Every structure is written in C-alpha cells, then in structure tokens.
Design a protein around this ligand. Structure first.
Ligand SMILES: *[C@@H]1O[C@H](CO)[C@@H](O[C@@H]2O[C@H](CO)[C@@H](O[C@H]3O[C@H](CO)[C@@H](O[C@@H]4O[C@H](CO)[C@@H](O[C@@H]5O[C@H](CO)[C@@H](OC6O[C@H](CO)[C@@H](O)[C@H](O)[C@@H]6O)[C@H](O)[C@@H]5O)[C@H](O)[C@@H]4O)[C@H](O)[C@@H]3O)[C@H](O)[C@H]2NC(C)=O)[C@H](O)[C@H]1NC(C)=O
Ligand SMILES: *[C@@H]1O[C@H](CO)[C@@H](O[C@@H]2O[C@H](CO)[C@@H](O[C@H]3O[C@H](CO[C@@H]4O[C@H](CO)[C@@H](O)[C@H](O)[C@@H]4O)[C@@H](O[C@@H]4O[C@H](CO)[C@@H](O)[C@H](O)[C@@H]4O)[C@H](O)[C@@H]3O)[C@H](O)[C@H]2NC(C)=O)[C@H](O)[C@H]1NC(C)=O
Ligand SMILES: *[C@@H]1O[C@H](CO)[C@@H](O[C@@H]2O[C@H](CO)[C@@H](O)[C@H](O)[C@H]2NC(C)=O)[C@H](O)[C@H]1NC(C)=O
Ligand SMILES: O=C(O)Cc1ccccc1Nc1c(Cl)cccc1Cl
Ligand SMILES: [Fe+3]
Ligand SMILES: [Zn+2]
Ligand SMILES: [Zn+2]
Length: 341
C-alpha cells in the first residue's frame, strides 16, 4: 500500500503533522507549505495527497480539480443514533462579533471601523462578510471599507494588514498561517478580544470555545461571553447565545480534499487514523490526538469529533452548495471558470 502525504500549512502545523507521522508508523507523512494555496498547489502537482480546507479554499481547490473526501463533523446539537462518521454534518454559523462595550456598533455602522478576519478567501472570515459588504455597498472597493484590518493573505503594507502582528519576533506579519498572531478563527477572535479590532468575522463556536474558561490561554482565560455581542444583518445586536437567529450565513464544514485518483485511499487511511487518534480514539489521549492542538486548530479544528463520510459522492460545488458557490463567484469578480494556478 501507499503512504498518505499530508500538507501542513506553516511550521506549527508541520510539527503536529510530524508527530502524527511518527505515531502512524509512517502511514502518514508530511509535506509543508507557507500558505493554504501553496499546499493546494503541492497537491495539484502530486507532491502532497491531501489537506483539510475551509470552504473557500475548497472552492479554489475544486476549480483546480481537487475533490472533497471527508468532512469535519463536530458534536451535534441534537441526539443522533448515528455514528459520528455516518452522521450528516450541520454547517457552522458565520458571525460578526463585537464587544458589548462598543455600544451603538451595528452591521450598519461597520464602515471605517477596524476588522479582524480569519484570512482572505476563508468562509466566515472573508467570503461571507465581504461578499455581503460588496453587495450592500454596490462597490468592489472592499479594501477601503474598514479603516484598518487584519486579513491574513492581503498585501502586508495595506490597510487590510495594518492590524496584523506576525509572530514573537514581529516577522511574518499578515501571512495566512498560524505564525501570524491574529490568524484563523482563534487569532481573529483574539484580535477582537484585545480591542485591536472592532469586529471579528468568525464562527459561533469560536466565541464559546474561547470564553468562560473554555480556553486557558492568557489572552482568553479571563474573557466572558456576556462581554460580546453578535451583529445581525437587520442591524440589531444580540447575545452570543442567539447565533441561530443572528448569523451572516451557514457555512459548509471544513473538509479534506485530494485528487480524485487518491481520494479512496486518502479516505481509507483517514478513517483508520481517526480510529486510532481521533476523539476517544484507541491511542488518544494516551499517545496522540489528531483533533487537538491546545486550541490552535492545527490541521483540523479542535472541535472536530470525527471526519465524516460524504453523501452522494459530491462534487465540490455540491459540497459547498450552489448558494455559496455563486456568492464566492460574485465576490471574486471584484478582484468564473478555471484554476487560479
Ligand atoms: C455555538 O457554539 C457553541 C460551541 O460549540 C455551541 O455550544 C456547544 O453545543 C453543544 C451541543 O449542541 C454543547 O453540547 C454538549 O453537551 C453535552 C455534554 O455537556 C453532550 O451530551 C448531550 O447529548 C444528548 C443529545 O443531544 C442530550 O441529552 C438530553 O436531552 C433530552 C431531551 O431534551 C433530555 O431528556 C429529557 O428531559 C426532558 C426534561 O423535561 C424531557 O424532555 C424528556 O422527557 C427527556 O427524558 C435530557 O435532559 C438530556 O438533556 C443533551 O442535550 C446533550 O446534547 C452534548 O451532546 C454535547 O457534548 C456544548 O457543551 C456546547 N459548548 C459550550 C462551550 O457551551 C452552541 O450550541 C452553538 N450555538 C448554536 C446556535 O449553534
Ligand atoms: C451578492 O449579490 C449577488 C447578486 O444577487 C448574489 O448572487 C445571487 O444569489 C442568488 C442566491 O443564491 C441567486 O439566485 C438563485 O436562486 C434560484 C433558486 O435556487 C434553489 O433553491 C430552491 C429552494 O430550496 C431549490 O429548489 C433549488 O434546489 C435551488 O437550491 C436558482 O435557480 C433556479 O432553479 C429553479 C429550479 O430548481 C428554476 O425554477 C429556475 O428557473 C432557476 O433556474 C436561480 O437560478 C438563482 O441562481 C442569483 O442568481 C445570484 N445572482 C447572480 C447575479 O449571480 C450573492 O449571493 C450575494 N452575495 C452574498 C454573500 O450574499
Ligand atoms: C498502517 O497501515 C497499514 C496498512 O493498512 C496497517 O496494517 C494493516 O492493519 C490492518 C489491521 O491490522 C490489517 O487488517 C492489515 O492486514 C494490515 N496491512 C498490512 C499490509 O500490514 C497498519 O495497522 C497501519 N498502522 C498505523 C499505526 O496506522
Ligand atoms: O444547492 C446546493 O448545491 C447545496 C445545498 C443546498 C441546501 C442545503 C445544503 C446544501 N449543500 C451542502 C452539502 Cl450537500 C454539503 C455540505 C454543506 C452544504 Cl451547504
Ligand atoms: Fe471556515
Ligand atoms: Zn440563516
Ligand atoms: Zn452529485
């Protein structure tokens, strides 16, 4: 049989991947790139097999021919008799979060404020909110909407990167990988928590997972849910308990992608790997946990219960949903067809 070559984005993911590789007895090995797009390119070249992707990245990967293989499944809201691997996924809720103390800030007063985004091209952090903003403003100048932002992946000298902080050494400012302090769900939420930005574009889970003791991180350990509010599209503000009635969109879950000709093998290997290292896997937590990384969401989101089988052998467009695909396409007209590589 063949090894599966995972692609890790940045050095922290690479360290975790290397641990996984060792524990997997080399059934999984690691390639690494500086950005998700570069990992997608390694896979396109056949120099890596697979990685787990946010839905926007799935769009990029899908235009280039890669296919969804298995999806992140978090704990469900409702009892299900089904095994996690066979439980239909529920998408996650993309939200716009602000501080309660920032009174009078609403969806309709976002112009000229400071924003924190997971990364350019990601679902909750970018495609959904910027797509909505472009539409409502009738303008493609989304790079001039917020006074300053951290939007990892943007031009580092631009306003879209002005709030990004890079690493310990201040290096890698605005890179779209975990070195950047404010990268990803957790980074963008931290950007809001520290009042670097006025608004964070993340998902509902992020708020809950980093407040009220759920995170022991120095920056998060003392945060309280009641100190945050969600911005609803109708211009109201709601407590973070009201995400189901105050979100920007329902996002398709992050999912593993690969070339078609490697998909069945990547799938088989991952199903076995999670049986070993997944949530209440045979050798997790004793040996290694594939879905933990000290609330850093490395390789997979830390709230992943399992990678689940897809229904109906879906194309990337079916997986993302026609709604979301068209929204991405419309936004991309600002900055239809074909691989971006
Ligand atoms: C924003 O993001 C947040 C972070 O992810 C989300 O919060 C997380 O949400 C999950 C669940 O959705 C939450 O859940 C965990 O909770 C427990 C462990 O704490 C887990 O175990 C349970 O699973 C069972 C199945 O769903 C449930 O068991 C019961 O339900 C029945 C029926 O109601 C009851 O039985 C009865 O009692 C009533 C009384 O009259 C009677 O009707 C009946 O006759 C019946 O006999 C029992 O009371 C019992 O509750 C139980 O609900 C629970 O789900 C669960 O699966 C998860 O592990 C996480 O704790 C939570 N995380 C944090 C940090 O808070 C938000 O949900 C999300 N918001 C939105 C809107 O999406
Ligand atoms: C920014 O603004 C943009 C411009 O409006 C937004 O893009 C547009 O988004 C719309 C919503 O996605 C498109 O509308 C489409 O809606 C139709 C119906 O879709 C279905 O849902 C029903 C009900 O569940 C189902 O039956 C079905 O399975 C679909 O899921 C589309 O389809 C039609 O199909 C039916 C039969 O199924 C048929 O009767 C019709 O003839 C028709 O073919 C329809 O074709 C639409 O695409 C808009 O087209 C789209 N506009 C543009 C210009 O592209 C964008 O979302 C905004 N961005 C954000 C972030 O909000
Ligand atoms: C690495 O992968 C190999 C191949 O799938 C695994 O070995 C297989 O294990 C299953 C269960 O033991 C057996 O049915 C097969 O016969 C084995 N195949 C071969 C050729 O060895 C192995 O368990 C995996 N190891 C880890 C740690 O992931
Ligand atoms: O119309 C479509 O193409 C897809 C569609 C419509 C309504 C509800 C869900 C979905 N698709 C969908 C699928 Cl099939 C998987 C994961 C996430 C999503 Cl949003
Ligand atoms: Fe996402
Ligand atoms: Zn909704
Ligand atoms: Zn299909």
């Amino acid at each position: 049989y063949t090894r599966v070559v995972w692609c890790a984005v940045g050095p922290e993911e690479q360290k975790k991947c290397q641990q996984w590789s060792q524990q997997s007895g080399q059934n999984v090995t690691c390639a690494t790139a500086s950005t998700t797009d570069d990992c997608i390119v390694l896979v396109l070249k056949g120099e890596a097999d697979a990685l787990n992707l946010d839905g926007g990245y799935i769009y990029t990967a899908g235009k280039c021919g890669l296919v969804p293989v298995l999806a992140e499944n978090r704990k469900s809201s409702k009892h299900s008799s089904l095994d996690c691997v066979l439980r239909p996924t529920e998408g996650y809720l993309a939200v716009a979060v602000v501080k309660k103390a920032n009174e009078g800030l609403t969806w309709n007063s976002l112009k000229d404020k400071k924003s924190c985004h997971t990364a350019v091209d990601r679902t909750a952090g970018w495609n959904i909110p910027m797509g909505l903003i472009v539409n409502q403003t009738g303008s493609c100048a989304f790079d001039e909407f917020f006074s300053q932002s951290c939007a990892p992946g943007a031009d580092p000298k631009s306003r879209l990167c002005a709030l990004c902080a890079g690493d310990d050494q201040g290096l890698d400012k605005c890179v779209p990988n975990s070195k950047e302090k404010y990268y990803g769900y957790t980074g963008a939420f931290r950007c809001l928590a520290e009042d670097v930005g006025d608004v964070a574009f993340v998902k509902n889970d992020t708020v809950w997972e980093n407040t009220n003791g759920e995170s022991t991180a120095d920056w998060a350990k003392n945060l309280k849910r009641e100190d945050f509010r969600l911005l609803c599209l109708d211009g109201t503000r709601k407590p973070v308990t009201e995400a189901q009635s105050c979100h920007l969109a329902v996002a398709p879950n992050h999912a593993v992608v690969s070339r078609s000709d490697r998909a069945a093998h990547v799938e088989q290997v991952l199903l076995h790997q999670q049986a070993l290292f997944g949530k209440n896997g045979k050798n997790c937590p004793d040996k290694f946990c594939l879905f933990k990384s000290e609330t850093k969401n490395l390789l997979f989101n830390d709230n992943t219960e399992c990678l689940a089988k897809l229904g109906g052998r879906p194309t990337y467009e079916e997986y993302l949903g026609t709604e979301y695909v068209t929204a991405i396409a419309n936004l991309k007209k600002c900055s239809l067809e074909a691989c971006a590589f």
